[PDB]
Amino acid sequence: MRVLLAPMEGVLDSLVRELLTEVNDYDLCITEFVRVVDQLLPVKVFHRICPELQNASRTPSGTLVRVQLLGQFPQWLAENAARAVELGSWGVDLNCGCLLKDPELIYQGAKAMREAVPAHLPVSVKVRLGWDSGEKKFEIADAVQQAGATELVVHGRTKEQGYRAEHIDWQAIGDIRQRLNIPVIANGEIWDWQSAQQCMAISGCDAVMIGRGALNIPNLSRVVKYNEPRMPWPEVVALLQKYTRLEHVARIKQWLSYLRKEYDEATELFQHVRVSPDIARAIQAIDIEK
Ligand SMILES: Cc1cc2nc3c(=O)[nH]c(=O)nc-3n(C[C@H](O)[C@H](O)[C@H](O)COP(=O)(O)O)c2cc1C
């Protein structure tokens, strides 16, 4: 089984990647997107989004990270893809879900990137089922394969369905997988060991990507792969303590907000820390127990 850590712009950055990968077995993390328009972005932008590039594309604990690009113009997707790779990125990812209601644009963008990235390095594309309909989710999928992309992440909802749980369609992901000859990584609504098993049995995918769930349960990759139990609240606290010592984070409150769905003890700690960065002391104060 492969488990990928999703890109979560405004939630996951290099610090949380280093934190999480330490206590997980993610096969690969995708960075938050590098926004591409019509310019080659400076080296400094890539290093800042992806500090791992200077560590052979790995978090300190050794988990691979891949730079993601977001954009439309194939020429510039290609030049930025080449630069990502020159700087050390283990392949490059293309965001087509945060998007493109034209399979031709996905085809051209991914192709330019494939040709611009050294053939032995992966070029992956992340998509949704469709814009306002999942009709010809095959067109999109065909586009990606025909472009020469290495693998396809499919978020099992259309753009309009947003993040509504009742709209997740793992079977659609399966129909795409049956049709293609590159790996399909199932994404969306994977929260625990059982939902992962349900997803893979229905889609037939042996690879999944987890986003929001990876914050609700900090060791979700090990939960999914090994049916490890969820990380114990004292360990979560110990982890949030380590987070404070990694150095300005208001993402801490955001994380605690995520943790409220799974850990009862998080709702009180959320209220405490909600309402200056003395929050560091408050968190660092707690004795583990309990
Ligand atoms: C806050 C937030 C930020 C996201 N940022 C990105 C992103 O930068 N690039 C991308 O391809 N998808 C992004 N996504 C989409 C997710 O990676 C993922 O496909 C989606 O959350 C569904 O997976 P999940 O149900 O496991 O969370 C983002 C989603 C959320 C909620």
Tell which residues of the chain come right before a gap with C–N over 2.5 A: 98, 247, 275
This structure's resolution (angstroms)? Answer: 2.1
Q: How many CB atoms lie within 10 A of CB 270?
A: 17
Same domain? 208 vs 251: no
68 in a labelled binding site? yes
Number of domains in the chain: 2
Task: State the CATH number of the domain containing residue 287.
Answer: 1.20.225.30
Q: Distance between CA 266 and CA 230 in Å, rounded? A: 14
Q: Residue of the nearest CA to atom 4 in ligand 1?
A: 8
Among the three residues 194, 229, 264, which one is the final residue of a domain in this structure?
229
Same domain? 141 vs 125: yes
Same domain? 200 vs 270: no
Same domain? 220 vs 234: no
Binding site membership of 97 for ligand 1 (Cβ less than 6 Å):
yes
Structure determination technique employed: X-ray
Question: Running DSSP on this structure, what letter comes out for residue 64?
Answer: B
98 is catalytic: yes
Same domain? 107 vs 179: yes
Tokens of 136: 């010809």
User: Residues of 44-68 as b/e, b for ≥16 C-beta within 10 angstroms?
Assistant: eebeebbbbbeeebbbeeebbbbbb
Catalytic residue among 96, 98, 199, 205: 98
Q: How many CB atoms lie within 10 A of CB 154?
A: 30
200 in a labelled binding site? no
Q: How far is CA 134 from CA 94, 103, 154, 157, 159, in A?
A: 20, 13, 12, 8, 9
Rg (CA), the chain: 19
